[PDB]
Amino acid sequence: NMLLNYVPVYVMLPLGVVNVDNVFEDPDGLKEQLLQLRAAGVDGVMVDVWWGIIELKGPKQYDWRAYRSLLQLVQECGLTLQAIMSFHQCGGNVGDIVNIPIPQWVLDIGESNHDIFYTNRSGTRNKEYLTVGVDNEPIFHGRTAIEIYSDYMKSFRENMSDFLESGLIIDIYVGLGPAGELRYPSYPQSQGWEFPGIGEFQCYDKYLKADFKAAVARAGHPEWELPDDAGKYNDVPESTGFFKSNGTYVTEKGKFFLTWYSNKLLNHGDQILDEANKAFLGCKVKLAIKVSGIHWWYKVENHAAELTAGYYNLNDRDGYRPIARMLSRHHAILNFTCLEMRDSEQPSDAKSGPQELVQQVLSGGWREDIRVAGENALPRYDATAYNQIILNARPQGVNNNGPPKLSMFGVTYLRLSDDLLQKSNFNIFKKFVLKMHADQDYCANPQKYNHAITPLKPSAPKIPIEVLLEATKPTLPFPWLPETDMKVDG
Ligand SMILES: OC[C@H]1O[C@H](O[C@H]2[C@H](O)[C@@H](O)[C@@H](O)O[C@@H]2CO)[C@H](O)[C@@H](O)[C@@H]1O
Ligand SMILES: OC[C@H]1O[C@H](O[C@H]2[C@H](O)[C@@H](O)[C@H](O)O[C@@H]2CO)[C@H](O)[C@@H](O)[C@@H]1O
């Protein structure tokens, strides 16, 4: 039955639906919009549950009232919800039309200790997320950064217990860094970065620097220092000593640093996921994380931008599959982006390979037998964008003899806006939803299309770093169709 080819579609709610004062501003307005999504066949919506709004007053001073009102409305409108534990700031990234900082009380500690923030070689502190360096430093009024995240999720679980039991919440996305993605803030627009700048390493806070120096000393090279020839945010790889041909990134020193740098992200995600699993144990929800799609410079040997962001991915080293393997122990979903981009749409001088990047990441996930979901990176309303998303959703097309051999677990569309609801744009969107659903009507019971959600089980045993890194072995991607068999048209 075709229903087995059904891929659910979710829509991101506007940023700031609940303002910085913790007030659900326009319920009536959101309601009319939600009802239109409901009529369009959309399966659910995604929303940021901002840490900076909820635990604003002080440590463990949570106020979940406004969000309870929002969830209640979503439920009344017949939509499911993907909730993001957003431990990051809204404001300094592309599309951030509202400013939502992390809790003021955390910012206050940052005043006396600037090293709780990601820091570049120049010493500029980025305040959008707490450096992985303090994950286990008990410097936040007695708590470590991870305990803060953990306490936040448990409070969410207990205070939204009725919504979790009623099956409103389907996925719990746990923000792991800037924009909620597991990465370093290597391309900060707030610091002048401009596409396709290679970005900068963000490991100069005293905690990360100390960890690195101890590490290299244990490796027999106490003299090794953090990168000093990697250039600046807007440089090109060839103009740097680190990324140029036969450059530093290929030396023993460089490989050690890059391994160290990327390993910090894997452990960061693994430790916080452990806490998310404990917090939601038994709940009928799946855990998920977001991996950024850094497609610029993907087509040159150095993969400069990926490296500075923390994805140690080269042509002979898979920097994403180990993330997928890590997620397997947590039975989590790998959410990737750039599902809408085509290589031809990128300036030639950016050496962009979004299509090949998507193929690599999705294949790695299916290879590790984990569920893969995704979203478009930029706002798109045209058929070509939708047709590319549909292609990636079912790379080898639909199967009439049963389920597709390859299919994404779901796709979340960025983002709900008046533009999307415009007669012509919305009309195209409705076709997009229909094709994602494999020409079937909206299906309220996920069980029908093999998406039944069982109680969250405890995470499997810890996987040692050496086993995770075995996943760096390059593999050939799964075959992709040149175009989808379920086109929207134009
Ligand atoms: O509301 C979700 C999320 O949206 C924005 O981040 C997106 C980004 O715009 C996309 O280009 C891609 O990178 O995925 C990101 C994560 O979904 C906001 O910047 C972010 O704060 C917010 O959580
Ligand atoms: O900021 C991260 C995103 O940067 C690029 O997006 C550019 C886009 O390429 C350009 O045409 C437009 O004018 O500005 C945006 C914002 O930087 C990448 O193309 C995206 O994949 C990144 O997510």
Side-chain angles (χ1 to χ4, degrees), residues 437-463:
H437 290 177
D439 283 327
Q440 306 307 299
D441 288 355
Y442 159 70
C443 179
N445 188 350
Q447 196 174 308
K448 289 183 176 181
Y449 54 85
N450 209 195
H451 258 61
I453 302 182
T454 58
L456 212 204
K457 304 301 181 64
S459 292
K462 235 277 193 181
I463 301 172

PDB file of all heavy atoms in Angstrom, residues 437-463:
ATOM      1  N   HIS A 437       3.453  12.962   0.899  1.00  0.00           N
ATOM      2  CA  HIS A 437       2.530  11.949   1.396  1.00  0.00           C
ATOM      3  C   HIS A 437       2.269  10.847   0.360  1.00  0.00           C
ATOM      4  O   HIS A 437       1.392   9.996   0.554  1.00  0.00           O
ATOM      5  CB  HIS A 437       1.207  12.612   1.804  1.00  0.00           C
ATOM      6  CG  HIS A 437       1.308  13.455   3.037  1.00  0.00           C
ATOM      7  ND1 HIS A 437       0.244  14.179   3.533  1.00  0.00           N
ATOM      8  CD2 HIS A 437       2.329  13.645   3.906  1.00  0.00           C
ATOM      9  CE1 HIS A 437       0.604  14.773   4.657  1.00  0.00           C
ATOM     10  NE2 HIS A 437       1.864  14.465   4.907  1.00  0.00           N
ATOM     11  N   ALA A 438       3.030  10.879  -0.732  1.00  0.00           N
ATOM     12  CA  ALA A 438       2.911   9.896  -1.807  1.00  0.00           C
ATOM     13  C   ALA A 438       1.501   9.869  -2.396  1.00  0.00           C
ATOM     14  O   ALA A 438       0.938   8.796  -2.623  1.00  0.00           O
ATOM     15  CB  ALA A 438       3.295   8.498  -1.285  1.00  0.00           C
ATOM     16  N   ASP A 439       0.944  11.056  -2.631  1.00  0.00           N
ATOM     17  CA  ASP A 439      -0.398  11.217  -3.184  1.00  0.00           C
ATOM     18  C   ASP A 439      -1.533  10.695  -2.306  1.00  0.00           C
ATOM     19  O   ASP A 439      -2.653  10.503  -2.784  1.00  0.00           O
ATOM     20  CB  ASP A 439      -0.504  10.563  -4.567  1.00  0.00           C
ATOM     21  CG  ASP A 439       0.129  11.402  -5.665  1.00  0.00           C
ATOM     22  OD1 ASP A 439       0.095  12.645  -5.567  1.00  0.00           O
ATOM     23  OD2 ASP A 439       0.646  10.815  -6.637  1.00  0.00           O
ATOM     24  N   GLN A 440      -1.257  10.462  -1.029  1.00  0.00           N
ATOM     25  CA  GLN A 440      -2.291   9.983  -0.123  1.00  0.00           C
ATOM     26  C   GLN A 440      -2.790  11.145   0.722  1.00  0.00           C
ATOM     27  O   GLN A 440      -2.066  12.113   0.944  1.00  0.00           O
ATOM     28  CB  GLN A 440      -1.741   8.891   0.800  1.00  0.00           C
ATOM     29  CG  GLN A 440      -1.090   7.741   0.069  1.00  0.00           C
ATOM     30  CD  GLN A 440      -1.999   7.150  -0.989  1.00  0.00           C
ATOM     31  OE1 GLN A 440      -3.086   6.654  -0.685  1.00  0.00           O
ATOM     32  NE2 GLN A 440      -1.563   7.208  -2.241  1.00  0.00           N
ATOM     33  N   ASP A 441      -4.029  11.053   1.185  1.00  0.00           N
ATOM     34  CA  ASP A 441      -4.589  12.099   2.025  1.00  0.00           C
ATOM     35  C   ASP A 441      -3.848  12.084   3.344  1.00  0.00           C
ATOM     36  O   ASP A 441      -3.197  11.095   3.693  1.00  0.00           O
ATOM     37  CB  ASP A 441      -6.069  11.846   2.309  1.00  0.00           C
ATOM     38  CG  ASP A 441      -6.942  12.085   1.104  1.00  0.00           C
ATOM     39  OD1 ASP A 441      -6.417  12.535   0.065  1.00  0.00           O
ATOM     40  OD2 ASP A 441      -8.157  11.825   1.206  1.00  0.00           O
ATOM     41  N   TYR A 442      -3.960  13.188   4.070  1.00  0.00           N
ATOM     42  CA  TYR A 442      -3.349  13.306   5.375  1.00  0.00           C
ATOM     43  C   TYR A 442      -3.766  12.074   6.166  1.00  0.00           C
ATOM     44  O   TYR A 442      -4.928  11.659   6.112  1.00  0.00           O
ATOM     45  CB  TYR A 442      -3.862  14.560   6.070  1.00  0.00           C
ATOM     46  CG  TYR A 442      -3.706  14.524   7.567  1.00  0.00           C
ATOM     47  CD1 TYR A 442      -2.447  14.601   8.160  1.00  0.00           C
ATOM     48  CD2 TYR A 442      -4.822  14.395   8.394  1.00  0.00           C
ATOM     49  CE1 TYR A 442      -2.301  14.550   9.542  1.00  0.00           C
ATOM     50  CE2 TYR A 442      -4.686  14.342   9.780  1.00  0.00           C
ATOM     51  CZ  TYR A 442      -3.425  14.421  10.345  1.00  0.00           C
ATOM     52  OH  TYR A 442      -3.294  14.375  11.714  1.00  0.00           O
ATOM     53  N   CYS A 443      -2.819  11.492   6.894  1.00  0.00           N
ATOM     54  CA  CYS A 443      -3.080  10.297   7.685  1.00  0.00           C
ATOM     55  C   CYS A 443      -2.807  10.600   9.156  1.00  0.00           C
ATOM     56  O   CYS A 443      -1.655  10.748   9.569  1.00  0.00           O
ATOM     57  CB  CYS A 443      -2.188   9.153   7.193  1.00  0.00           C
ATOM     58  SG  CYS A 443      -2.385   7.625   8.109  1.00  0.00           S
ATOM     59  N   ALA A 444      -3.878  10.689   9.936  1.00  0.00           N
ATOM     60  CA  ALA A 444      -3.792  11.020  11.356  1.00  0.00           C
ATOM     61  C   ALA A 444      -3.096   9.999  12.251  1.00  0.00           C
ATOM     62  O   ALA A 444      -2.455  10.374  13.232  1.00  0.00           O
ATOM     63  CB  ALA A 444      -5.183  11.303  11.889  1.00  0.00           C
ATOM     64  N   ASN A 445      -3.219   8.718  11.923  1.00  0.00           N
ATOM     65  CA  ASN A 445      -2.605   7.666  12.728  1.00  0.00           C
ATOM     66  C   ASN A 445      -1.250   7.242  12.157  1.00  0.00           C
ATOM     67  O   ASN A 445      -1.182   6.503  11.177  1.00  0.00           O
ATOM     68  CB  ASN A 445      -3.546   6.465  12.801  1.00  0.00           C
ATOM     69  CG  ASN A 445      -3.071   5.417  13.778  1.00  0.00           C
ATOM     70  OD1 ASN A 445      -1.947   5.488  14.282  1.00  0.00           O
ATOM     71  ND2 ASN A 445      -3.920   4.434  14.052  1.00  0.00           N
ATOM     72  N   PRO A 446      -0.148   7.698  12.780  1.00  0.00           N
ATOM     73  CA  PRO A 446       1.220   7.385  12.345  1.00  0.00           C
ATOM     74  C   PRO A 446       1.503   5.894  12.190  1.00  0.00           C
ATOM     75  O   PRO A 446       2.371   5.491  11.414  1.00  0.00           O
ATOM     76  CB  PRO A 446       2.082   8.024  13.433  1.00  0.00           C
ATOM     77  CG  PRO A 446       1.240   9.193  13.881  1.00  0.00           C
ATOM     78  CD  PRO A 446      -0.131   8.566  13.969  1.00  0.00           C
ATOM     79  N   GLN A 447       0.765   5.079  12.931  1.00  0.00           N
ATOM     80  CA  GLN A 447       0.936   3.636  12.875  1.00  0.00           C
ATOM     81  C   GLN A 447       0.691   3.126  11.451  1.00  0.00           C
ATOM     82  O   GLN A 447       1.369   2.207  10.987  1.00  0.00           O
ATOM     83  CB  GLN A 447      -0.033   2.969  13.852  1.00  0.00           C
ATOM     84  CG  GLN A 447       0.285   1.519  14.176  1.00  0.00           C
ATOM     85  CD  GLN A 447      -0.621   0.973  15.263  1.00  0.00           C
ATOM     86  OE1 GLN A 447      -0.748   1.569  16.332  1.00  0.00           O
ATOM     87  NE2 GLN A 447      -1.257  -0.167  14.997  1.00  0.00           N
ATOM     88  N   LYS A 448      -0.271   3.732  10.758  1.00  0.00           N
ATOM     89  CA  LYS A 448      -0.599   3.326   9.394  1.00  0.00           C
ATOM     90  C   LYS A 448       0.590   3.373   8.442  1.00  0.00           C
ATOM     91  O   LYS A 448       0.696   2.537   7.539  1.00  0.00           O
ATOM     92  CB  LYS A 448      -1.735   4.184   8.839  1.00  0.00           C
ATOM     93  CG  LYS A 448      -3.085   3.900   9.477  1.00  0.00           C
ATOM     94  CD  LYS A 448      -4.183   4.723   8.828  1.00  0.00           C
ATOM     95  CE  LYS A 448      -5.544   4.374   9.402  1.00  0.00           C
ATOM     96  NZ  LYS A 448      -6.627   5.169   8.754  1.00  0.00           N
ATOM     97  N   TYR A 449       1.478   4.347   8.623  1.00  0.00           N
ATOM     98  CA  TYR A 449       2.646   4.424   7.760  1.00  0.00           C
ATOM     99  C   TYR A 449       3.945   4.065   8.485  1.00  0.00           C
ATOM    100  O   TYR A 449       5.000   4.648   8.244  1.00  0.00           O
ATOM    101  CB  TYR A 449       2.738   5.798   7.073  1.00  0.00           C
ATOM    102  CG  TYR A 449       2.706   7.011   7.975  1.00  0.00           C
ATOM    103  CD1 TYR A 449       3.866   7.486   8.582  1.00  0.00           C
ATOM    104  CD2 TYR A 449       1.518   7.714   8.182  1.00  0.00           C
ATOM    105  CE1 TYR A 449       3.843   8.643   9.376  1.00  0.00           C
ATOM    106  CE2 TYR A 449       1.483   8.861   8.967  1.00  0.00           C
ATOM    107  CZ  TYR A 449       2.650   9.321   9.562  1.00  0.00           C
ATOM    108  OH  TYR A 449       2.617  10.446  10.353  1.00  0.00           O
ATOM    109  N   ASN A 450       3.839   3.076   9.369  1.00  0.00           N
ATOM    110  CA  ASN A 450       4.964   2.552  10.135  1.00  0.00           C
ATOM    111  C   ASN A 450       5.763   3.599  10.908  1.00  0.00           C
ATOM    112  O   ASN A 450       6.993   3.570  10.906  1.00  0.00           O
ATOM    113  CB  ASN A 450       5.900   1.774   9.201  1.00  0.00           C
ATOM    114  CG  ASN A 450       6.651   0.656   9.917  1.00  0.00           C
ATOM    115  OD1 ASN A 450       7.626   0.113   9.393  1.00  0.00           O
ATOM    116  ND2 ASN A 450       6.194   0.302  11.116  1.00  0.00           N
ATOM    117  N   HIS A 451       5.059   4.508  11.577  1.00  0.00           N
ATOM    118  CA  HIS A 451       5.688   5.560  12.376  1.00  0.00           C
ATOM    119  C   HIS A 451       5.164   5.526  13.803  1.00  0.00           C
ATOM    120  O   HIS A 451       5.146   6.550  14.486  1.00  0.00           O
ATOM    121  CB  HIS A 451       5.390   6.943  11.796  1.00  0.00           C
ATOM    122  CG  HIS A 451       6.516   7.532  11.006  1.00  0.00           C
ATOM    123  ND1 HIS A 451       7.015   6.941   9.865  1.00  0.00           N
ATOM    124  CD2 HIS A 451       7.208   8.684  11.168  1.00  0.00           C
ATOM    125  CE1 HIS A 451       7.964   7.706   9.356  1.00  0.00           C
ATOM    126  NE2 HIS A 451       8.100   8.770  10.127  1.00  0.00           N
ATOM    127  N   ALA A 452       4.718   4.358  14.247  1.00  0.00           N
ATOM    128  CA  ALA A 452       4.208   4.219  15.604  1.00  0.00           C
ATOM    129  C   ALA A 452       5.340   4.571  16.561  1.00  0.00           C
ATOM    130  O   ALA A 452       6.490   4.195  16.335  1.00  0.00           O
ATOM    131  CB  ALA A 452       3.741   2.792  15.843  1.00  0.00           C
ATOM    132  N   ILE A 453       5.024   5.302  17.621  1.00  0.00           N
ATOM    133  CA  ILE A 453       6.058   5.672  18.575  1.00  0.00           C
ATOM    134  C   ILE A 453       5.870   4.954  19.902  1.00  0.00           C
ATOM    135  O   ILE A 453       4.840   5.078  20.560  1.00  0.00           O
ATOM    136  CB  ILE A 453       6.098   7.199  18.800  1.00  0.00           C
ATOM    137  CG1 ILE A 453       6.340   7.897  17.454  1.00  0.00           C
ATOM    138  CG2 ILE A 453       7.207   7.551  19.795  1.00  0.00           C
ATOM    139  CD1 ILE A 453       6.447   9.399  17.530  1.00  0.00           C
ATOM    140  N   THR A 454       6.882   4.186  20.274  1.00  0.00           N
ATOM    141  CA  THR A 454       6.848   3.427  21.507  1.00  0.00           C
ATOM    142  C   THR A 454       7.565   4.193  22.610  1.00  0.00           C
ATOM    143  O   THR A 454       8.307   5.136  22.337  1.00  0.00           O
ATOM    144  CB  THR A 454       7.517   2.064  21.300  1.00  0.00           C
ATOM    145  OG1 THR A 454       8.861   2.259  20.847  1.00  0.00           O
ATOM    146  CG2 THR A 454       6.751   1.259  20.255  1.00  0.00           C
ATOM    147  N   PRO A 455       7.337   3.807  23.875  1.00  0.00           N
ATOM    148  CA  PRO A 455       7.978   4.477  25.007  1.00  0.00           C
ATOM    149  C   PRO A 455       9.489   4.549  24.837  1.00  0.00           C
ATOM    150  O   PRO A 455      10.126   3.571  24.431  1.00  0.00           O
ATOM    151  CB  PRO A 455       7.569   3.611  26.191  1.00  0.00           C
ATOM    152  CG  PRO A 455       6.202   3.160  25.797  1.00  0.00           C
ATOM    153  CD  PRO A 455       6.395   2.776  24.344  1.00  0.00           C
ATOM    154  N   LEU A 456      10.055   5.713  25.141  1.00  0.00           N
ATOM    155  CA  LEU A 456      11.494   5.923  25.026  1.00  0.00           C
ATOM    156  C   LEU A 456      12.205   4.947  25.958  1.00  0.00           C
ATOM    157  O   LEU A 456      11.895   4.877  27.147  1.00  0.00           O
ATOM    158  CB  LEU A 456      11.858   7.353  25.433  1.00  0.00           C
ATOM    159  CG  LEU A 456      13.049   8.040  24.757  1.00  0.00           C
ATOM    160  CD1 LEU A 456      13.582   9.122  25.688  1.00  0.00           C
ATOM    161  CD2 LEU A 456      14.140   7.041  24.434  1.00  0.00           C
ATOM    162  N   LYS A 457      13.161   4.199  25.418  1.00  0.00           N
ATOM    163  CA  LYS A 457      13.907   3.232  26.215  1.00  0.00           C
ATOM    164  C   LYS A 457      15.235   3.830  26.655  1.00  0.00           C
ATOM    165  O   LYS A 457      15.721   4.788  26.057  1.00  0.00           O
ATOM    166  CB  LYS A 457      14.178   1.970  25.392  1.00  0.00           C
ATOM    167  CG  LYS A 457      12.934   1.307  24.823  1.00  0.00           C
ATOM    168  CD  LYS A 457      11.957   0.910  25.918  1.00  0.00           C
ATOM    169  CE  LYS A 457      10.724   0.216  25.342  1.00  0.00           C
ATOM    170  NZ  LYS A 457      11.067  -1.076  24.668  1.00  0.00           N
ATOM    171  N   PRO A 458      15.841   3.274  27.714  1.00  0.00           N
ATOM    172  CA  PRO A 458      17.125   3.816  28.163  1.00  0.00           C
ATOM    173  C   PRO A 458      18.163   3.652  27.056  1.00  0.00           C
ATOM    174  O   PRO A 458      18.053   2.758  26.222  1.00  0.00           O
ATOM    175  CB  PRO A 458      17.442   2.982  29.408  1.00  0.00           C
ATOM    176  CG  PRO A 458      16.713   1.689  29.156  1.00  0.00           C
ATOM    177  CD  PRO A 458      15.404   2.161  28.572  1.00  0.00           C
ATOM    178  N   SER A 459      19.161   4.522  27.037  1.00  0.00           N
ATOM    179  CA  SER A 459      20.184   4.442  26.006  1.00  0.00           C
ATOM    180  C   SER A 459      21.017   3.177  26.135  1.00  0.00           C
ATOM    181  O   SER A 459      21.178   2.640  27.232  1.00  0.00           O
ATOM    182  CB  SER A 459      21.098   5.667  26.068  1.00  0.00           C
ATOM    183  OG  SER A 459      20.395   6.833  25.679  1.00  0.00           O
ATOM    184  N   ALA A 460      21.531   2.699  25.006  1.00  0.00           N
ATOM    185  CA  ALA A 460      22.367   1.509  24.999  1.00  0.00           C
ATOM    186  C   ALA A 460      23.705   1.881  25.636  1.00  0.00           C
ATOM    187  O   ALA A 460      23.980   3.057  25.876  1.00  0.00           O
ATOM    188  CB  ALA A 460      22.574   1.023  23.571  1.00  0.00           C
ATOM    189  N   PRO A 461      24.554   0.883  25.919  1.00  0.00           N
ATOM    190  CA  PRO A 461      25.859   1.148  26.532  1.00  0.00           C
ATOM    191  C   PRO A 461      26.698   2.163  25.761  1.00  0.00           C
ATOM    192  O   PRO A 461      26.560   2.319  24.548  1.00  0.00           O
ATOM    193  CB  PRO A 461      26.509  -0.232  26.558  1.00  0.00           C
ATOM    194  CG  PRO A 461      25.339  -1.143  26.742  1.00  0.00           C
ATOM    195  CD  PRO A 461      24.333  -0.568  25.769  1.00  0.00           C
ATOM    196  N   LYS A 462      27.569   2.850  26.486  1.00  0.00           N
ATOM    197  CA  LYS A 462      28.458   3.848  25.910  1.00  0.00           C
ATOM    198  C   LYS A 462      29.340   3.209  24.839  1.00  0.00           C
ATOM    199  O   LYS A 462      29.818   2.085  25.008  1.00  0.00           O
ATOM    200  CB  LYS A 462      29.336   4.430  27.017  1.00  0.00           C
ATOM    201  CG  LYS A 462      29.289   5.940  27.164  1.00  0.00           C
ATOM    202  CD  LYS A 462      30.222   6.640  26.189  1.00  0.00           C
ATOM    203  CE  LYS A 462      30.388   8.109  26.572  1.00  0.00           C
ATOM    204  NZ  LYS A 462      31.282   8.859  25.639  1.00  0.00           N
ATOM    205  N   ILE A 463      29.546   3.919  23.734  1.00  0.00           N
ATOM    206  CA  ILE A 463      30.396   3.424  22.657  1.00  0.00           C
ATOM    207  C   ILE A 463      31.717   4.184  22.738  1.00  0.00           C
ATOM    208  O   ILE A 463      31.738   5.409  22.628  1.00  0.00           O
ATOM    209  CB  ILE A 463      29.770   3.678  21.270  1.00  0.00           C
ATOM    210  CG1 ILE A 463      28.410   2.986  21.172  1.00  0.00           C
ATOM    211  CG2 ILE A 463      30.706   3.165  20.177  1.00  0.00           C
ATOM    212  CD1 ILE A 463      27.632   3.345  19.924  1.00  0.00           C
TER     213      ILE A 463
END
